[PDB]
Each structure stands twice: as structure tokens, then as C-alpha cells.
Amino acid sequence: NTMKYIKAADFQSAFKAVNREILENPQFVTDSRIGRCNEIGSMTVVVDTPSSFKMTDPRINRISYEYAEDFWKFMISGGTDAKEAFKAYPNVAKFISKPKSDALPANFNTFYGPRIAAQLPALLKELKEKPNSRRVVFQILESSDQALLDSDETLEYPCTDSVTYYIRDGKLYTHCHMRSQNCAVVMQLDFYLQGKLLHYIANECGVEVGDYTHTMVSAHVFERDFDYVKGFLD
Amino acid sequence: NTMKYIKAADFQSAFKAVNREILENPQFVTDSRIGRCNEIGSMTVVVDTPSSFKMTDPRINRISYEYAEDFWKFMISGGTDAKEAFKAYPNVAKFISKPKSDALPANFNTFYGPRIAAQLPALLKELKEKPNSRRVVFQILESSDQALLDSDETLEYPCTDSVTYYIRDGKLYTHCHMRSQNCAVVMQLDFYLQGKLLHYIANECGVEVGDYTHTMVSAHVFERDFDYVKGFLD
Ligand SMILES: Cc1cc2nc3c(=O)[nH]c(=O)nc-3n(C[C@H](O)[C@H](O)[C@H](O)COP(=O)(O)O)c2cc1C
Ligand SMILES: Cc1cc2nc3c(=O)[nH]c(=O)nc-3n(C[C@H](O)[C@H](O)[C@H](O)COP(=O)(O)O)c2cc1C
Ligand SMILES: Nc1ccn([C@H]2C[C@H](O)[C@@H](COP(=O)(O)O)O2)c(=O)n1
Ligand SMILES: Nc1ccn([C@H]2C[C@H](O)[C@@H](COP(=O)(O)O)O2)c(=O)n1
């Protein structure tokens, strides 16, 4: 039976367990916007030790850690010069190009970094100053992104919905809610970015780290990636 | 050990199981913005039969179904005349009053209805026309709501983060992500509103209903409500 709740000691064990479950016990086998995938709806993943966001198995190699670190620096710096930041990676071109349609402005982008940057002052203030706040939610996906739905744009319609942080008894807890997760490939990047970000937040707040929860409305592995996944399982 | 994943046949069984777990096996006992509560972080609740959103046990009476239905009509109609809609309920006054601070405008409100109304056309179009879309997310909590964090306003800083809908094989699946859930009281209302809304969506799309998933970054019961909860358990 499809296991939707996965608790693991570290990011890599969670990553392997999620991918194995999607391959072996999918809830749906579905033809999606970008091809056929196995899918589990509404998976919840808990990582006990969020310092482990750099996975050690070199067979999990579709997101290199050079790329992941370049992406982290691009994101946390809150800039929009993706062409410069990812000039060494030509295959990300369709995700970093200017909008084509005149409908939405040319300043429009879906980069997470500027959105995190805009919210950091108010959210850090709440996180540091309102004891036991439940209100600290970084919004990534925005309703204004819905202008992308009926367009031919290739920009990411944000896969990450929100990241909630809360502190209890000196520890920072994190809940990343994903609208849509490519578990075999991009999740390696998402885990890296979220691991870096939560440590950034914990350090700004002077607190230690609890655990990390990752919910995914669609947790999927494309059929084209099954051989890749099998290559890192066992 | 604290059970964070609860699967139940109907909303009431989920409701009772969640409340029991928070009372008996909290992750945190914490003094919050609005008083001491037992709390479980990042709970996931699955309801197999989402038609069951009106609970039958009359001891679960803090949200009357007259009030819940008035709230539903107020929400789905997308209006802002809360004073008129809830005139028969004086205790909701602090949640429906105009903003006090000149910082945010007088048109500012955090009612869910207008936000659902604004997104319905684009999201229904995606849901009906893009097969197996993963993109249909109603955003409730918005980053612009963060202006409430450092204010003395009593308006709700949205407890509901987002509601994602997706269709696979003729069935509508729903994932409601809550930032913050008062599980003993308001969750009765949230379950009613989400049950009504998902049936509204399924009917607009001409599809049947799958299941309903409810994730809560903070799932809590205030100590002041423990006697009430005990009164409906068993
Ligand atoms: C700003 C930006 C947004 C991106 N968005 C997506 C995306 O939404 N979906 C996706 O699959 N890859 C996206 N990518 C590319 C991934 O980060 C990564 O390069 C890719 O998953 C590697 O795929 P491959 O090794 O199979 O070619 C994005 C890259 C950038 C720089
Ligand atoms: C527009 C609106 C927003 C509300 N927001 C909240 C809220 O954020 N938190 C809350 O506890 N009750 C809120 N309420 C009140 C609840 O819907 C409900 O009346 C209350 O939980 C009943 O509490 P009581 O029976 O313990 O008095 C709101 C009511 C309205 C009309
Ligand atoms: N941070 C991100 C951004 C996007 N995606 C993936 C999920 C989908 O495989 C695809 C987005 O497609 P869709 O919008 O149809 O969900 O990219 C991901 O895994 N992580
Ligand atoms: N639809 C809603 C709106 C709010 N709340 C609850 C959660 C908290 O008990 C409180 C909101 O307080 P806070 O903003 O501190 O989380 O109201 C809820 O349960 N459901």
C-alpha cells in the first residue's frame, strides 16, 4: 500500500525512500504537463537532522553541488541576474529568460530569491520578537503567478508553495509545502536550498535547529527518470 | 509517541482523533500569541470521504451549523459585508471590523471569499482544461498580509495558507495546507468550509470526489478548551 508519510534521519535517506515509494507504489500513473510520471498525492516527509542537506551518494548526480551552491547564492542574494549567475549552465535557459507575452510585464519573474528578500525583514522580526509565533510563513507561489497558467511562457510557475518557520524551546522547526515536486531530480536541489535557508534563518535568530517537514501535493517521478532512480537505489 | 499522520473515514473521526492526539501526546506545550496550548507541529490528516464535512455529534457545538452555513454563504459569495452577514453573531466583531492603523488601507481585509473569487476563473480554467494539472492552488495567506504582524489589528492573519485541487482519473483531490489550526473549535468551521468548497469545485468541473488532505504547521488545542474536547471524546 502506498506509504504517504516518510520519516528519515537525514535528507538522503528521505530522498531515497520517497523515490523508491513513488517508483514501487504510486498512487497515480499519470500523463502530466511535462510527460508521464508515477505520482503520490500529498506525501509528508520528515527529516530529523536538517544539517544533512548535501547528500553524500555521488550517484545522485543530476543536481551537482556546484550548481546547487550557485543556485543558493543566487537565491539568498535576492537578485534577478540569472543569466549571469547560471552562465555556466546552458540547460536552464528556458527558466531564466524574459517573459514573451505582453500581458505580464518585463520585470515579471518567478525567482524565489526576490520574494524571500522582500519578506525577510517582517518575517525575521516576527520570528525573533513574537514568542512562539505561528505566523512566520514565506510565501513563494503567489496568486499573481496564475497569469502564467494560460500562457506559452516557460518560466517556473512556483513549485514551492510556502516555507513556514517556527521556534519552540530554542529550536527552529521548518515546514516546506511544495505544490509540485519532481522527487528524482529537482528535489535534490529543493532539499539543498531549504537546508541552506533554514540554517540561514536559525543563525539569524541565534537558535538551534529542530526538524524539517516537506509536504508535497504532487510528489512525482517521471518515467524517463526511472533508470536514474534505480541507479541510486541500493 | 506523538502521532502526526492521521487517516480517518470521515471528517468527524479525523476531528476527534486529531483533538485526542493533541490533548494526550502533544509535541509542545506552549504559551502562544493567544494563550497556552498543546501543539503538534506539521500534522497531516486524511479524510477518505469528504462529503462528511457536517459532523453529526451534537456535542461538537462550538461552531453551530447555522453559523458555518452563514459563513460558507459569506465566503463563496465573495463579499465584504461581514457586519451584515454575521449580524446575528456579536462575538465575531473583532475579526470583521475595519482596519485601525493608517498604514494599510481601509479596503484591506483578510476575508477568504474575495481571494477565492479573484482566483476562481483562472484556477477553474486550469483545472478543467489542463489535463492532470498540478498547478491549481488557491492562495489564501498572502505576503501582503505580513503588514498585520507588527500591528495592533485584530483581523485574522490568514490561518489557511493554500488549498490545492487536482483531478486524476475523474476524481477531485484536495489538499488544504493550514498555517495554524485551532483543532478543537475553528477546525470544525474550516472542515465545513473546505468540504463545501471542494464540492463546489468538483461540481463546477463535473467530476467526482477523491479524498481530502489537511496539513497543519501548527495543530493546537488551547488549554482553556480541554474540558470542551473531553466532552466530545467518548
Ligand atoms: C530559475 C530556475 C528555475 C527552474 N525551474 C525549474 C522547474 O520549474 N522545473 C524543472 O524541472 N527544472 C527547473 N530548473 C532547472 C533545475 O534547477 C535543474 O537544472 C534541472 O532539474 C536539472 O535537470 P536535468 O539534469 O534532468 O537536465 C530551473 C532552473 C532555474 C535556474
Ligand atoms: C471573518 C472572520 C474571521 C475569523 N477569524 C478567526 C480567527 O482567526 N481565529 C479564531 O479563533 N476565530 C476566528 N473567527 C471566529 C470563528 O469563526 C468562530 O466564531 C469562533 O472560533 C468561535 O469561538 P468561541 O465559540 O470559542 O467563542 C473569525 C470569524 C469571522 C467572521
Ligand atoms: N523548486 C521546484 C520547481 C519546479 N519543480 C518541478 C515539479 C514539476 O516536475 C515541474 C513543474 O511542473 P508543474 O508546474 O506542471 O507542476 O518542476 C520542482 O520539483 N521543484
Ligand atoms: N480559518 C482559521 C483562522 C484562524 N484559526 C486559528 C488558529 C489560531 O488558534 C488562531 C490564529 O492565531 P495565530 O495567527 O497566532 O496563529 O485562529 C483557525 O483555526 N482557522
Q: Are strands A35-47 and A5-8 parallel, antiparallel or unpaired?
A: parallel
Whole-angstrom distance, CA of residue A10 vs CA of residue B158: 32
Nearest partner of B176 among B25, B81, B45, judged by Cα = B45
User: Residue B121: which H helix or E strand, with range?
Assistant: helix B112-129
| Cβ A155 vs Cβ B135: under 8 Å | no
Q: Which three cell numbers stand for residue B153?
A: 489589528
Nearest partner of A12 among A52, A41, A45, A44, judged by Cα = A52
User: For every residue of A114-149, which 3-state class applies, written as one string?
Assistant: HHHHHHHHHHHHHHHHCCCCCCCEEECCCHHHHHHC
Helix, coil or strand: residue B227: helix
Whole-angstrom distance, CA of residue B149 vs CA of residue B219: 20
Question: Does 3.30.572.10 match the CATH number of domain B44-215?
Answer: yes
A48-213: CATH, from 3.30.572.10, 3.20.20.70, 3.30.1360.10, 3.30.470.20: 3.30.572.10
Helix, coil or strand: residue A216: strand
Contacts of B59 (CB under 8 A, 6+ apart): B231, B232
| Cβ B153 vs Cβ B100: under 8 Å | yes
CA of A135 to the centre of ligand 4 (A): 9
Substitution candidate for ligand 3 out of B127, B134, B166 with most atoms within 8 A of CB: B134
Nearest partner of B210 among B164, B179, B177, judged by Cα = B164
Query: Residue A171, Cα to own-chain centre: how many angstroms?
Result: 22
Q: Are strands A35-47 and A208-222 parallel, antiparallel or unpaired?
A: antiparallel
Whole-angstrom distance, CA of residue B199 vs CA of residue A123: 35
DSSP letter string, A184-204? TTHHHHHHHHHHHHHHHHHHH
Could B46 and A41 be called an inter-chain contact, meaning their C-beta atoms sit closer than 8 Å?
no
Q: Which three cell numbers stand for residue B66?
A: 447555522
Other beta carbons within 10 angstroms of residue B58's beta carbon come to 8
Nearest partner of A179 among B215, B33, B193, B35, judged by Cα = B215
Relative orientation angle of helices A65-76 and A112-129, to the nearest 10 degrees: 70
Contacts of A11 (CB under 8 A, 6+ apart): A47, A50, A52, A53, A54, A55, A191, A195, A212
CB A182 near ligand 3, within 6 Å: yes
In chain A, domain spans: 48-213
Q: Find the angle CA(A21)-CA(A24)-CA(A27) to the nearest 5 degrees.
A: 75
User: Residue A153: which H helix or E strand, with range?
Assistant: none
Whole-angstrom distance, CA of residue B194 vs CA of residue A129: 32
Contacts of A91 (CB under 8 A, 6+ apart): none
Residues of A in contact with B146 (CB under 8 A): 119, 122-123, 126
Q: Which three cell numbers stand for residue A182?
A: 519532481
Nearest partner of A127 among A163, A99, A156, A98, judged by Cα = A163
b vs e for B160-193, b when ≥16 Cβ sit within 10 Å of the residue's Cβ? bbbbbbbbbeeebbbbbbbbbbbbbbbbbbbbbb
| Cβ B4 vs Cβ B44: under 8 Å | yes
Whole-angstrom distance, CA of residue A39 vs CA of residue A31: 10
